Amino acid sequence: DLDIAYEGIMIVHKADSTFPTKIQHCINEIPVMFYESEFEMFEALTDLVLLLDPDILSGFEIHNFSWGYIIERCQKIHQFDIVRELARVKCSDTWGYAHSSGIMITGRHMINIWR
Amino acid sequence: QLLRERCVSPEEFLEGENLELDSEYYINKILIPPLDRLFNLIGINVGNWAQE
Amino acid sequence: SDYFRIQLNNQDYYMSKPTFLDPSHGESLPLNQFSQVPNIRVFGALPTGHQVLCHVHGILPYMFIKYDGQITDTSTLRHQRCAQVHKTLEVKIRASFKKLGNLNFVADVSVVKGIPFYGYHVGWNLFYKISLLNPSCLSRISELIRDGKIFGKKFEIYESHIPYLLQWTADFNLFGCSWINVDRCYFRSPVLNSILDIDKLTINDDLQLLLDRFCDFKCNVLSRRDFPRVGNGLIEIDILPQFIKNREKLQHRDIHHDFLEKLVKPYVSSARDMINELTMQREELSLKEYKEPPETKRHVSGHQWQSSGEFEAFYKKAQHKTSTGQIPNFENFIDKNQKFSAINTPYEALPQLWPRL
Amino acid sequence: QLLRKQDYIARNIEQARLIGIDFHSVYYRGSQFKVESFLIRICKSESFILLSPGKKDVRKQKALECVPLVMEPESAFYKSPLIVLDFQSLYPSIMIGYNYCYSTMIGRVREINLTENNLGVSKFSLPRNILALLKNDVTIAPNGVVYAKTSVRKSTLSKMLTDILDVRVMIKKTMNEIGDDNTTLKRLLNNKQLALKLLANVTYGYTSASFSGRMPCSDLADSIVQTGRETLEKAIDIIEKDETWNAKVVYGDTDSLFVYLPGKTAIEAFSIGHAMAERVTQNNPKPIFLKFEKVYHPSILISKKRYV
Amino acid sequence: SDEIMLEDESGRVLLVGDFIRSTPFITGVVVGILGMEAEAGTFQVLDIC
DNA sequence: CCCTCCCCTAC
DNA sequence: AATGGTAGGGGAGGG
Ligand SMILES: Nc1ccn([C@H]2C[C@H](O)[C@@H](COP(=O)(O)OP(=O)(O)OP(=O)(O)O)O2)c(=O)n1
Numbered sequence: 054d055l056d057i058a059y060e061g062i063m064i065v066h067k068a069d070s071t072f073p074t075k076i077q078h079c080i081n082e083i084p085v086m087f088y089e090s091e092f093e094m095f096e097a098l099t100d101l102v103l104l105l106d107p108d109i110l111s112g113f114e115i116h117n118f119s120w121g122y123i124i125e126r127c128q129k130i131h132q133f134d135i136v137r138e139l140a141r142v143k144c145s146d147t148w149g150y151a152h153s154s155g156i157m158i159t160g161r162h163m164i165n166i167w168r
Numbered sequence: 169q170l171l172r173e174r175c176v177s178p179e180e181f182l183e184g185e186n187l188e189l190d191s192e193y194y195i196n197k198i199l200i201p202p203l204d205r206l207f208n209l210i211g212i213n214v215g216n217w218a219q220e
Numbered sequence: 221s222d223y224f225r226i227q228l229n230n231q232d233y234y235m236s237k238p239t240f241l242d243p244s245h246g247e248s249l250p251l252n253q254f255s256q257v258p259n260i261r262v263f264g265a266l267p268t269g270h271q272v273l274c275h276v277h278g279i280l281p282y283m284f285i286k287y288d289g290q291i292t293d294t295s296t297l298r299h300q301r302c303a304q305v306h307k308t309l310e311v312k313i314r315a316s317f318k319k320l321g322n323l324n325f326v327a328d329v330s331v332v333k334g335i336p337f338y339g340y341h342v343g344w345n346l347f348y349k350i351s352l353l354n355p356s357c358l359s360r361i362s363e364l365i366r367d368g369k370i371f372g373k374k375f376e377i378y379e380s381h382i383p384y385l386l387q388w389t390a391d392f393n394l395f396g397c398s399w400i401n402v403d404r405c406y407f408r409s410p411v412l413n414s415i416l417d418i419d420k421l422t423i424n425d426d427l428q429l430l431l432d433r434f435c436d437f438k439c440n441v442l443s444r445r446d447f448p449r450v451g452n453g454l455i456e457i458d459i460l461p462q463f464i465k466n467r468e469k470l471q472h473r474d475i476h477h478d479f480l481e482k483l484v485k486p487y488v489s490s491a492r493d494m495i496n497e498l499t500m501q502r503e504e505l506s507l508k509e510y511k512e513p514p515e516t517k518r519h520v521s522g523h524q525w526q527s528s529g530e531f532e533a534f535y536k537k538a539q540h541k542t543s544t545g546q547i548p549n550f551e552n553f554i555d556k557n558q559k560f561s562a563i564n565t566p567y568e569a570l571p572q573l574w575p576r577l
Numbered sequence: 578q579l580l581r582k583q584d585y586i587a588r589n590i591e592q593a594r595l596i597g598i599d600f601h602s603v604y605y606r607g608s609q610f611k612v613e614s615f616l617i618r619i620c621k622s623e624s625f626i627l628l629s630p631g632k633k634d635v636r637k638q639k640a641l642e643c644v645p646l647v648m649e650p651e652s653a654f655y656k657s658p659l660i661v662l663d664f665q666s667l668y669p670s671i672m673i674g675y676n677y678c679y680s681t682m683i684g685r686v687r688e689i690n691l692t693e694n695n696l697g698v699s700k701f702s703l704p705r706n707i708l709a710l711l712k713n714d715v716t717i718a719p720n721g722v723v724y725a726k727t728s729v730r731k732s733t734l735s736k737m738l739t740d741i742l743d744v745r746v747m748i749k750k751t752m753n754e755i756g757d758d759n760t761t762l763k764r765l766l767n768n769k770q771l772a773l774k775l776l777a778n779v780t781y782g783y784t785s786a787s788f789s790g791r792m793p794c795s796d797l798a799d800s801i802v803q804t805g806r807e808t809l810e811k812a813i814d815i816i817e818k819d820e821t822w823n824a825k826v827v828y829g830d831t832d833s834l835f836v837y838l839p840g841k842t843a844i845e846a847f848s849i850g851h852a853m854a855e856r857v858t859q860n861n862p863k864p865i866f867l868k869f870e871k872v873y874h875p876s877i878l879i880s881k882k883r884y885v
Numbered sequence: 886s887d888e889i890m891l892e893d894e895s896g897r898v899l900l901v902g903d904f905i906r907s908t909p910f911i912t913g914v915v916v917g918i919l920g921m922e923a924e925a926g927t928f929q930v931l932d933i934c
Numbered sequence: 935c936c937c938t939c940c941c942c943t944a945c
Numbered sequence: 946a947a948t949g950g951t952a953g954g955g956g957a958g959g960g
């Protein structure tokens with residue numbers, strides 16, 4: 054029962070001076086955090102996952118979307134292995150994508166909700 | 169015009185200017201065989217009811 | 221309770237150098253140390269809600285093959301045969317995968333008694349126990365021994381289709397999403413992790429009591445230089461196989477070494493908890509009780525079938541064939557020789573090779 | 578909410594706690610993994626040693642020669658009540674009653690040699706005077722495989738199957754005692770009983786493993802299917818052997834019996850079905866039990882595995 | 886849920902007070918609110934144009 | 935007017 | 946990379 058509000062929104066904004074306050078006011082319920090780029094946003098997501106330490110990471114069609122999308126972005130653009138950062142340890146699955154989620158994070162489980 | 173040749177998706181069908189469902193194909197080949205089975209187990213042919 | 225309870229949320233294994241918490245020797249080739257030993261990582265959550273990483277040591281995979289000698293050994297030829305097969309296995313595996321020191325694939329070979337499961341066997345059979353080091357290549361090693369590449373003759377492999385994690389969970393009465401009742405632990409570099417700030421927001425009074433009960437900070441915490449933390453979470457512990465007390469609750473029976481049944485229903489222990497939960501959730505619905513009446517059934521004289529007469533004739537012919545003049549009895553059939561007292565039973569053999577206190 | 582309405586997480590956790598596998602291996606692995614997790618524990622409890630054949634050994638075993646029974650239905654429109662019988666847990670109850678397992682197989686009744694035998698993917702050798710000793714405590718299967726009786730050795734598959742089936746019938750008996758509670762609990766209990774039924778069915782299917790198997794036995798599964806077919810045929814004969822019940826079975830799929838009662842005022846069709854079920858059940862071993870469970874007053878049997 | 890706000894292509898503020906309550910309004914109508922920020926992002930109302 | 939290939943449902 | 950079987954029917958395209 055810690056203070057995380059169980060919900061959150063991360064938005065990219067290079068900072069004009071009206072979008073953050075407008076978004077915060079139109080939300081009025083969930084605390085929104087704004088960052089300068091998407092690399093800072095991914096680092097904040099890693100810190101958030103390491104804070105709560107959830108045993109299950111899920112989503113709707115996480116292959117071509119949220120989790121797989123973030124992983125492919127970090128692998129192609131920023132050259133940053135986020136799968137090794139989200140794991141609970143510091144130090145090519147064809148059967149995966151067929152009947153389950155092909156993403157394998159050490160320590161945590163992955164649930165493809167649509168499957 | 170084999171069945172594979174038309175094969176429009178809902179997006180293509182709802183945006184096409186002159187596109188109408190194949191009423192003949194739909195009716196016959198998706199309604200007449202199963203009703204024919206179910207009602208020939210009784211003794212009536214459903215195909216004759218559609219031609220009229 | 222009085223035990224440190226850890227749940228099985230996820231598990232994985234890795235390789236590491238043998239520390240003082242890992243076994244480094246054996247009984248067949250004791251003078252040859254190990255180059256790498258397997259360690260199991262158990263990502264679990266304490267009963268209070270805090271995640272914990274557990275490094276289980278001493279768990280080595282194994283597989284059985286048929287013994288080659290006779291049951292009339294003098295307990296000294298057994299060690300010689302074990303050393304010989306260990307040397308042969310190590311040499312052949314090193315030759316395949318490209319003074320025989322620093323064992324890298326085979327850990328130890330022992331002699332255990334057993335009863336085969338694929339068929340009706342009513343007598344003790346002697347087996348080997350090829351304790352391996354790297355489980356990932358285990359199957360591959362079997363693919364050699366079963367092919368006749370190691371020895372001259374082909375050898376059938378026993379208990380190799382069971383993975384390493386399944387063997388570990390079965391040998392210690394462990395279940396997925398169930399608690400690991402352990403009475404002793406070994407803590408690592410700072411107990412409360414300070415990755416970003418979690419050493420302050422997540423701690424409460426219950427976790428502090430659990431720490432004060434099991435952490436002494438004088439002779440219980442491992443050094444930071446030899447055992448650094450490799451977990452991105454809360455408290456990290458190390459346990460020995462002697463510490464896991466989920467075992468010793470298993471009921472080991474030996475009713476298959478003789479015609480003992482010839483002169484109790486809850487065999488699956490994980491079903492009793494489901495039954496109890498069902499009784500609870502049906503008593504919450506004001507249901508009276510559960511009961512089942514037995515129906516008096518009268519089967520056929522022998523439940524005969526179409527070819528029952530031919531089957532009886534063939535059984536008579538086979539009984540005439542497989543017979544040599546005498547009469548068999550249920551008491552004098554199995555010979556009362558080869559006492560098999562010194563030979564270890566599979567559940568009495570795995571406590572061996574555990575490193576030390 | 579999508580995973581909470583279906584209770585996916587809690588159901589998978591319960592299924593992992595029952596079997597003994599990790600939470601991820603419940604939906605990521607196959608069906609043989611659960612049967613293996615059960616068998617390793619049950620056999621280590623009794624100091625058993627399991628066999629591990631290779632891929633070349635499973636392919637070179639004897640092919641399955643026993644097929645189930647699917648009666649050709651009399652395709653027509655039935656106006657009179659059509660009682661629908663069904664065996665509950667047919668193959669598991671068969672393995673429990675007739676004591677079929679790997680630990681009780683002695684060998685095929687024909688070609689019993691003293692030094693070279695064959696049972697599935699293994700070879701063995703019988704002792705000198707074991708048949709003359711066990712001639713009384715055997716139960717020859719319809720396939721021709723000799724099995725040891727329960728008086729000399731209780732099989733291991735039987736134990737797991739009895740526990741799983743007891744839990745399943747308890748879940749079903751609790752589910753069939755609530756009418757006011759909505760699907761909130763009945764659907765979960767139905768899912769649990771279906772999961773246990775699938776567990777028993779894959780425990781059967783773990784035998785003879787026609788392709789991609791790890792410890793198959795063609796003779797065991799052949800005997801199971803053969804004695805199932807024989808039990809179904811004996812049930813057909815028992816039902817059609819009564820003059821007071823002028824009934825005739827029109828369809829059945831390896832366990833079911835569709836008996837037709839022309840003009841039989843369905844109110845009494847329930848009593849006739851219950852009497853038939855009791856009569857067929859009292860002629861079989863203990864765990865076998867025939868269930869009535871419904872009746873079709875109007876019905877149309879199109880073909881095999883197709884009706885309404 | 887139960888609040889009147891003022892949007893002018895750059896955000897919204899809560900129209901708190903008493904002059905704003907004793908007047909019927911329909912969304913979309915523009916006004917000339919003259920008020921005073923008191924203790925938060927909530928605008929008081931003194932006169933309306 | 936028979937074959938394979940594909941879909942998917944029932945034990 | 947990992948996989949439990951059998952049986953049954955119906956539709957499309959090329960023959
Ligand atoms: N996925 C399946 C379904 C069924 N069967 C086999 C085993 C059963 O013994 C037999 C009967 O099928 P049922 O669907 O009727 O299941 P059960 O009879 O075992 O249980 P119940 O009658 O309670 O539904 O078919 C199988 O091997 N695999």
Ligand SMILES: [Ca+2]
Nearest residue numbers: 663664665832
């Ligand atoms: Ca059935």
Ligand SMILES: [Ca+2]
Nearest residue numbers: 663830832833
């Ligand atoms: Ca059925």
